[PDB]
Design a protein around this ligand. Structure first.
Ligand SMILES: OC[C@H]1O[C@H](O[C@H]2[C@H](O)[C@@H](O)[C@@H](O[C@H]3[C@H](O)[C@@H](O)[C@@H](O[C@H]4[C@H](O)[C@@H](O)[C@@H](O)O[C@@H]4CO)O[C@@H]3CO)O[C@@H]2CO)[C@H](O)[C@@H](O)[C@@H]1O
Ligand SMILES: [Ca+2]
Ligand SMILES: [Ca+2]
Length: 418
């Protein structure tokens, strides 16, 4: 494991990580209070599969509950009331045992953190911030969903649970808990959620104070059409918007530009994600993914959230693309361990490592064929990747001598290495 910051000081931890999203939406309902025991038990496997890091669920306890007729949810971590670690995924002691086993197997533990809001109304919680002290967004006039005096980012729904993350006491609180996660729970980095809710610069401060040389990734899911008409972003590309956030927070960013193309464009169009950017400074900060607990399905209740899921017909193509390309890839728990894409992903992880593909490796796209044809310059080998393509052999598009590395999905997924 390579451990530094990028040339622009972005915290991509060497640019060589391969992350597993360590949970699905329905885990708290499917294996109540047992998740950490399960992960503890799977540690050796996760490490054997080739993952360098695991994205853990929010460790802060969440006893929330909601019902929207058919749909219902709560307890997943995103509506926490406390920093207490005895929540729906397991106890404090089990968490420590899981983190210790993962770390012991050499898998860095990244914690999902939600600074934007908290379960304000929760009757019994250890964190009680009164009103009238500027601790809350609604302590100030709130015209709509844009920054106000008590909150420099968007709000979550009504904004009534939004914290003034910039308040010295709120900043501090989070800052000490991050430090806590690092010293007592083996945290190797963080996943910042709902980054549109507070300033980018604040994530950099938190990273600076608590875990400067660690890995971080921020979730910025906000289209151009969501910015005011006068904002440069209202007319920017998805790439530009996420790139900008990355620049300010000094953290890699989830590639929603790639996700958007996978959903709305054809496969040839996948070259328009951040990870396909010709400028190394742009592609090395992209954290690529096929689906997460928000966009994808999950085993169990309601099929999970499935807000923007990739149809089954592009799953193998999608994993072949992120696993062989620039940016830092993330594998969703379910595709790996529930749905049987495990052996296929294991092979692609081995191909990526053997070719020495990393965050900044170059990528060149070929246009004389159907599908997506790309040449990836790994530090150890060159790969030719052909997805849903009429390409016949690697020599038609690359110089050198190639061997087959992967041939799946009836020739729809083909990978060759020099
Ligand atoms: O008091 C604040 C608000 O409280 C009530 O809001 C409810 C929402 O209506 C529910 O839909 C739900 O929200 C979920 C959300 O649906 C779910 O997707 C998840 O979101 C995370 C996301 O997974 C994650 O990746 C991340 O980065 O950010 C998202 C936001 O944290 O979790 C949410 C929280 O459980 O629950 C809330 C709270 O129960 C109320 O209806 C509102 O009117 C009120 O403003
Ligand atoms: Ca690394
Ligand atoms: Ca906010």
């Amino acid at each position: 494991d390579q451990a530094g910051k990028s040339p622009n000081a972005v915290r991509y931890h060497g640019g060589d990580e391969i992350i597993l999203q360590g949970f699905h939406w329905n885990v708290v309902r499917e294996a109540p209070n047992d998740w950490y025991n399960i992960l503890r038990q799977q540690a050796a496997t996760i490490a054997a599969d080739g993952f360098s890091a695991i994205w853990m669920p929010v460790p802060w306890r969440d006893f929330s509950s909601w019902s929207d007729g058919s749909k219902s949810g709560g307890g997943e971590g995103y509506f926490w009331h406390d920093f207490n670690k005895n929540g729906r995924y397991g106890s404090d002691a089990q968490l420590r045992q899981a983190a210790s086993a993962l770390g012991g197997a050499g898998v860095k533990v990244l914690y999902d953190v939600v600074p934007n809001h908290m379960n304000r109304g929760y009757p019994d919680k250890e964190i009680n911030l009164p009103a009238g002290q500027g601790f809350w967004r609604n302590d100030c006039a709130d015209p709509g969903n844009y920054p106000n005096d008590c909150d420099d980012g968007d709000r979550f729904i009504g904004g009534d649970a939004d914290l003034n993350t910039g308040h010295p006491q709120v900043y501090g609180m989070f800052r000490d808990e991050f430090t806590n996660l690092r010293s007592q729970y083996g945290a190797g980095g963080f996943r910042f959620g709902f980054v549109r809710g507070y300033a980018p610069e604040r994530v950099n401060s938190w990273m600076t104070d608590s875990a400067d040389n660690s890995f971080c990734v921020g979730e910025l899911w906000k289209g151009p059409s969501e910015y005011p008409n006068w904002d440069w972003r209202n007319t920017a590309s998805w790439q530009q918007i996420i790139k900008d956030w990355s620049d300010r927070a000094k953290c890699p960013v989830f590639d929603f530009a790639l996700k958007e193309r996978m959903q709305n464009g054809s496969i040839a169009d996948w070259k328009h994600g951040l990870n396909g950017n010709p400028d190394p400074r742009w592609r090395e900060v992209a954290v690529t993914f096929v689906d997460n607990h928000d966009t994808g399905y999950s085993p169990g209740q309601n099929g999970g959230q499935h807000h923007w899921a990739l149809q089954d017909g592009l799953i193998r193509q999608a994993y072949a693309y992120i696993l062989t390309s620039p940016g830092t890839p993330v594998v969703y728990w379910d595709h790996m361990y529930d749905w049987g894409y495990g052996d296929f992903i294991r092979q692609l992880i081995q191909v990526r490592r053997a070719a020495g593909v990393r965050a900044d490796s170059a990528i060149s796209f070929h246009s004389g064929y159907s599908g997506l044809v790309a040449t990836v310059s790994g530090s150890q080998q060159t790969l030719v990747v052909a997805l849903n393509s009429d390409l016949g052999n690697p020599g038609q598009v690359a110089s050198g001598s190639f061997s087959e590395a992967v041939n799946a999905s009836n020739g729809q997924v083909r990978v060759w290495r020099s």
